[PDB]
């Protein structure tokens, strides 16, 4: 019996209020800035490179993905901003590689395609990291991997950051071998030149497809990717006339995987939230100093804006409860202020509940600056904050993290930061991430100097202090920008707040391809 | 409520469990339900007893009524066929929000 | 293909026969006696206690259950007669506790509610035993436990029978901890005062609900069950305005258990028996000396009165066969006379068959007195009766026992007595249970005395023998009455024969919530 | 029966030969250079810092380790050269942290001690990487972790490379939580100030020891590491008077782990090699262009110089066989020339044999430059080299890699490079590692330029080519030096060739603390 | 006390992790010294120990 009437979250914001008008205007500008930058990245290398690419009869990398996935199906692209201003004088749109999750023959798959128009498809250090992140996502969720291979090899000027280390180019083949041993299909389509060391990617794949004239595989047509590779050498499993033919063959290969998705969780009919998503612009804004009720964000992403809060009046700075997104059950943990001992205990209790019932967890990070409280006897927080860091780490249910505000210090770890292997991590265009907030850092620097100056007896003037402080503030702002963080692969993308519900729905759906394991906890330091 | 129970039962693996019935049955005693309905500004207290045969004995104030009926669909409109103290009648039933609409 | 026509059991009884008329009249009187006694127990402590209970704004215990379970769903109450005349001058209706199985949010759950109107909810020795029996049922069938806590603590005058031993009050918390470790949800609702030692019940629960003004938890409002308990102490997970609000919250908690029932057995459409159930009154009667065909009882409870008998002509005093009740497959074992070597062997063979196919077992106990046969070389029976005691004990399929007649001596053990952990055990109002029948006992006593008297040479006169015999007969009758046995928790309730099919259907449905395990047998002494 | 006489490897080198004299002289100079540099690193921060450290009553970090481990037991230090010239103007001896494997109370443990004399114990980016490498070693081999905590927090000027990412400081606590859940003991001894974010390390540990006056734990004595932390806060499990007392307590804690080492492999009595180890100086030398027989290296490290070669005459450029080191069975794979198709097939066959029998694998990397062969139809090599990359990756037996020469290109991957998770990786002082050898790179660069120049028609003069080539050669030499590679944590240390047998014996002994799992292979592309 | 119950709960987890048998020496005190001492605080923590002791699978002797 599911006919019980229940209460719903959310309230109607005051559209006429000046605060709402200002917050909407600021957030809208950030979203528009995000959109137009992606448009530029969409063009890859440029008109001359794109014209040359098409002149050889090859499809553009994004057109290949469009033809590969099922007609009209959504495509979840990841790390669109990798390599954004990462290198001083070189522009590398998207890192030279396009990765995302789409549906092929009704099966969710991870698609990894080299962008040959960007530096001829050479592998920059960020390119390796982006690919390795994609492989990690595919393995953790048991998603078949499809490699649209068109590459020019490693970027020699930066070889030391590509070749040698464990998380360097060598790890790519290690991941392929491991996934194959686990029956996670590895499919490679050589749609262009495969350079030295990239010839392994077609070979290490379970099934392989090579284009007749364009494809070349060699550790050019005669040496590799030849009819020799297809027939005499036997490296090729399927022979394709052109790019369209190869993509058609790939869809057939996936259809023969003999795989059917099975769900471990209970399912209920989906319902839209009771409030518009675009109202999040006015509610949240771009000023991290102002505070908002995280429940408002929840009310606009969960099915029917229905939410069962757990321990509502205890540790109120943290909000935990049960909801459903697109029918899936989810346990939501979101910050609503500074973390306290009660908040950490409340979170630790909640995480155990979700792990016991095998319920996916969603974290909404919005940590607060220390301008309000200098110390507050933080020693008490240390004893309890660890209990949450330890429960979150050991949890085996799928975990997704969304940074809707600040993310500073140990608060990042307790809320399932990147170091704690959430299945996905997304950030809103207004976020900031740093070891500490910029102002606090300045104060700390100031005290040390003033006191040391005092030992010398030299006077640290008021002007002297300000001069010291300004560079520090600037560095922190520059390095906490959402773009700096996404340029390196610290998150899986910057998403428009109006798209939060859709992105979460796609992400949780993909994460459910793998069975949920039993959670084993360490010692809880009572 | 019985229709809602049947709707839930449709999607369950244990299709024929006796728990899915709406008999409201008890061991060695009879279940009496205290329902409250508002007519205009007046609250009406109804004591409904679930009989073994499937009928209902309803007491309002000092008067007792023997009630039995079922729901049937004509076109898109649900109809209630009921008999109160031996008097049979048909009416169109619509339950929207917290109001029960009976059209006869 | 299931279109085969098959034979059906049962025959039309002779309603005009004097035996049928007498048997119906006697059984009807017993059923009427059973009904009116339950009506009195339904009232609990009484009008003054009930008026005081309502005056505090609290719901009556049985009204709480009515509001907790799904609308119109049946409720299977257990041990209604616990404490019936158990204590010399104290009346304890139902033992001061109400236990049963009902559907909450579409999930079968065990409900354990203290009756505050009975001795203020104090725990008598029978009260602990009734609760422990309910917990045992919940664990064996994986049923979530809901505790409607309104208690006054242990009954000090009888503390030695409540506190110390393994099956005493302490075991209640042990059971809660064990079920929690097995993911069998433990939900506590404090709807009234929680006394010393009862404060553990809210704390030991996975999720907890406490009423704002009425609830008090302390190892009164300020000390415990305070807003202190809800917020400052954190013992409370949910805060409820009144009894109705708390029951609504409980239904929400169960809906979030992420549990879905799965059946291990094959299912077929249900069918009503071909004969009226009330005819069992005339067929069985109340005279245990007369004998009836157990097949008649079977014909009136199984779907379509269809029964496949196994080894019909071998060991005919025992009836075994396959049938279906409400669509579930069941193997039925019922007595039809004195147990023989062939009967025991036939039963042992049948039990192995059911365990191999994972088919639930139903036992119908009706053992016979030894008036017909003094010894019959019972030494032969000992060698074989054990084979059945040993097979029945090791069987891991769900087992339900129904005593429709006598239950004496080792015949009780072979037919899955209380000592052999049947999932449920029910008795008809006409049953008798004892070590031996009363008459036999008297004879035994008589012989010993007469012979010892002979050694003395003192004459044991005929009058002397009768005088010795009469008290013994009386004791046995008093102690074998269905009410004596049910007052103590030896069975799970006394049920009207017309309700046998419904009770079995509800019981088997609940027992199927747990997966059926593989059966491991000991050594069969061939 | 083990009395069979067998042949032994090795031959007596010509000590009078000029080549041997030159090779010995060059290798000796490298070893002497290595020794004196370690001596300087041994001093940590310096005399002023060391004097200040002792003035506070604290032991020096290396004296702490000496007192912690069993008397006279060897200590295997790891990554001694981390941070060597890594940062432009900052000297960070050993990265500010000392890690290694030693025996405590008869149990092999991983010891991680902060060097407070180096930058006050601040965490540089290399410091985090060194600690994370140590934790990875401990987890893969089930070695208890002992943290001698004396730290000053993160190095703010380089926060972006310490805090945010998955392999950044946050991962340290994640590793502690995971190891604790696996029953790999985590013991923390706070022997000095624990700064913000380091207070978690004592809390996340299973058992914790704090020094009375020196220790401070706070997210100074009053705020944290106080008698408050030991008693009022309860973060401390043991209270120690001084450094000596704390180390004594640590030994007691390890003795109570209830752990006993069990070996999965067969054991035979140890025997010394039949040839002196220092002869490796003359045999190998420092000139990578000259070639030597790897069998000579094997003959001087295996027990009794006994070696059973597998497929000796097939793919002779690769040497594979069975031997024993300190009684442990080992399968040895070593390069003896350029890799061919036969060599790769021979290696793939051998690796399957070792995995089937659960025999540890040792790799001796000495890959050859392409000066001898420009291409040799390397396309054939690609088809087969992958088969070896894929077998090596999936092997679950313990793997140890020793780079005794060059390590270039895909040859690194096939011989279990850092990317393939060998339990340990060591390098000799004469090694070079790069994407390709320096000369080849220059040629490649030259061709591209000469041809592009030809399209322009501008003449690329002979001088022009040389000028282009010289910088490239220099970069490659600088970046392939053993010191560059070890400064970053790419290997676990640079070892003297005369110490090769001892280091391997200690490493394999530690790796055997974990049970050997069954190996699951992917698809072998036949 | 609350601290005593927490200390016991921590200890029992340690023994169970290492598979170490547990021995209990019961000597509980009368309430003559303390009438109540806000025993409500004890209830919240005493349960943590009752629950750890019950689930422990190492041999236990009292």
Tab-separated table of C-alpha atoms in Angstrom, chain D residues 289-427:
chain	number	residue	atom	x	y	z
D	289	UNK	CA	76.046	0.476	-25.125
D	290	UNK	CA	78.144	-2.563	-24.229
D	291	UNK	CA	76.230	-5.780	-23.595
D	292	UNK	CA	76.672	-8.451	-20.926
D	293	UNK	CA	75.150	-11.855	-20.250
D	294	UNK	CA	72.325	-11.506	-17.737
D	295	UNK	CA	73.049	-15.077	-16.632
D	296	UNK	CA	76.193	-13.711	-14.978
D	297	UNK	CA	74.033	-11.423	-12.831
D	298	UNK	CA	71.735	-14.335	-11.973
D	299	UNK	CA	74.652	-16.605	-11.057
D	300	UNK	CA	75.696	-14.152	-8.330
D	301	UNK	CA	72.354	-13.689	-6.532
D	302	UNK	CA	70.583	-17.083	-6.492
D	303	UNK	CA	71.135	-19.802	-3.898
D	304	UNK	CA	74.128	-21.898	-4.925
D	305	UNK	CA	74.120	-20.296	-8.387
D	306	UNK	CA	71.624	-22.978	-9.428
D	307	UNK	CA	69.287	-22.109	-12.296
D	308	UNK	CA	66.906	-24.174	-14.426
D	309	UNK	CA	66.496	-22.364	-17.736
D	310	UNK	CA	63.191	-22.594	-19.599
D	311	UNK	CA	63.175	-22.574	-23.411
D	312	UNK	CA	66.880	-21.776	-23.494
D	313	UNK	CA	67.326	-21.951	-27.277
D	314	UNK	CA	64.015	-20.282	-28.215
D	315	UNK	CA	63.814	-16.504	-28.149
D	316	UNK	CA	67.324	-16.349	-26.724
D	317	UNK	CA	67.139	-12.570	-26.214
D	318	UNK	CA	65.011	-13.332	-23.126
D	319	UNK	CA	66.131	-15.543	-20.236
D	320	UNK	CA	63.561	-17.317	-18.055
D	321	UNK	CA	64.087	-19.998	-15.432
D	322	UNK	CA	63.518	-21.195	-11.892
D	323	UNK	CA	65.806	-20.547	-8.928
D	324	UNK	CA	65.719	-19.888	-5.187
D	325	UNK	CA	66.711	-16.843	-3.131
D	326	UNK	CA	67.153	-17.413	0.609
D	327	UNK	CA	65.110	-20.596	0.185
D	328	UNK	CA	62.140	-18.989	-1.572
D	329	UNK	CA	61.195	-20.205	-5.067
D	330	UNK	CA	61.421	-17.537	-7.767
D	331	UNK	CA	60.846	-17.322	-11.507
D	332	UNK	CA	63.325	-14.946	-13.127
D	333	UNK	CA	62.729	-13.015	-16.353
D	334	UNK	CA	65.639	-10.980	-17.679
D	335	UNK	CA	66.471	-9.189	-20.917
D	336	UNK	CA	69.450	-10.380	-22.953
D	337	UNK	CA	68.926	-8.310	-26.081
D	338	UNK	CA	66.210	-6.813	-28.231
D	339	UNK	CA	62.723	-8.216	-27.724
D	340	UNK	CA	61.423	-10.388	-30.564
D	341	UNK	CA	58.171	-12.179	-31.291
D	342	UNK	CA	59.671	-15.428	-30.004
D	343	UNK	CA	60.901	-13.712	-26.839
D	344	UNK	CA	57.455	-12.287	-26.067
D	345	UNK	CA	55.789	-15.659	-26.653
D	346	UNK	CA	58.399	-17.364	-24.471
D	347	UNK	CA	57.794	-14.856	-21.684
D	348	UNK	CA	54.018	-15.225	-21.893
D	349	UNK	CA	54.321	-19.004	-21.598
D	350	UNK	CA	56.662	-18.692	-18.613
D	351	UNK	CA	54.441	-16.251	-16.707
D	352	UNK	CA	51.498	-18.643	-16.984
D	353	UNK	CA	53.638	-21.415	-15.491
D	354	UNK	CA	54.630	-19.335	-12.463
D	355	UNK	CA	51.061	-18.168	-11.837
D	356	UNK	CA	49.778	-21.747	-12.008
D	357	UNK	CA	52.271	-22.912	-9.363
D	358	UNK	CA	52.068	-19.711	-7.264
D	359	UNK	CA	55.762	-18.875	-7.700
D	360	UNK	CA	56.974	-15.291	-7.124
D	361	UNK	CA	58.333	-13.504	-10.188
D	362	UNK	CA	61.478	-11.377	-10.472
D	363	UNK	CA	62.108	-9.139	-13.489
D	364	UNK	CA	65.548	-7.868	-14.520
D	365	UNK	CA	65.040	-4.980	-16.942
D	366	UNK	CA	67.896	-4.113	-19.373
D	367	UNK	CA	66.162	-2.963	-22.656
D	368	UNK	CA	68.370	-2.101	-25.688
D	369	UNK	CA	68.642	1.157	-27.704
D	370	UNK	CA	67.499	1.231	-31.380
D	371	UNK	CA	70.967	2.225	-32.660
D	372	UNK	CA	71.463	-1.437	-33.789
D	373	UNK	CA	68.034	-1.783	-35.508
D	374	UNK	CA	66.061	1.192	-36.898
D	375	UNK	CA	62.669	-0.620	-37.244
D	376	UNK	CA	63.135	-4.387	-37.888
D	377	UNK	CA	59.434	-4.522	-38.937
D	378	UNK	CA	58.410	-3.653	-35.332
D	379	UNK	CA	54.772	-4.196	-36.453
D	380	UNK	CA	55.364	-7.943	-35.860
D	381	UNK	CA	56.556	-7.140	-32.308
D	382	UNK	CA	53.322	-5.200	-31.585
D	383	UNK	CA	51.118	-8.240	-32.154
D	384	UNK	CA	53.158	-10.312	-29.669
D	385	UNK	CA	54.458	-7.751	-27.139
D	386	UNK	CA	50.849	-7.157	-25.999
D	387	UNK	CA	50.441	-10.832	-25.050
D	388	UNK	CA	53.236	-10.358	-22.493
D	389	UNK	CA	51.893	-6.951	-21.264
D	390	UNK	CA	48.540	-8.648	-20.677
D	391	UNK	CA	49.905	-11.736	-18.880
D	392	UNK	CA	52.203	-9.655	-16.666
D	393	UNK	CA	49.385	-7.306	-15.667
D	394	UNK	CA	46.998	-10.080	-14.605
D	395	UNK	CA	49.582	-12.117	-12.673
D	396	UNK	CA	48.687	-12.241	-8.974
D	397	UNK	CA	51.944	-13.757	-7.675
D	398	UNK	CA	54.251	-11.242	-5.950
D	399	UNK	CA	56.320	-9.361	-8.518
D	400	UNK	CA	59.620	-7.540	-7.973
D	401	UNK	CA	61.360	-5.511	-10.677
D	402	UNK	CA	65.044	-4.568	-10.804
D	403	UNK	CA	66.280	-2.177	-13.494
D	404	UNK	CA	69.926	-3.083	-14.128
D	405	UNK	CA	70.151	-1.163	-17.415
D	406	UNK	CA	68.016	0.782	-19.855
D	407	UNK	CA	64.229	0.936	-19.651
D	408	UNK	CA	62.712	2.470	-22.780
D	409	UNK	CA	59.330	2.529	-24.486
D	410	UNK	CA	56.925	-0.398	-24.443
D	411	UNK	CA	59.737	-2.684	-23.287
D	412	UNK	CA	59.262	-1.137	-19.853
D	413	UNK	CA	55.612	-2.225	-19.745
D	414	UNK	CA	56.296	-5.805	-20.813
D	415	UNK	CA	58.936	-6.157	-18.085
D	416	UNK	CA	56.616	-5.078	-15.237
D	417	UNK	CA	57.246	-1.359	-15.026
D	418	UNK	CA	55.986	0.898	-12.270
D	419	UNK	CA	52.582	1.088	-13.968
D	420	UNK	CA	52.068	-2.662	-13.476
D	421	UNK	CA	52.152	-2.664	-9.640
D	422	UNK	CA	55.234	-4.749	-8.829
D	423	UNK	CA	55.478	-5.196	-5.076
D	424	UNK	CA	58.850	-3.425	-5.207
D	425	UNK	CA	60.887	-1.669	-7.885
D	426	UNK	CA	64.620	-1.014	-7.549
D	427	UNK	CA	67.215	0.474	-9.893
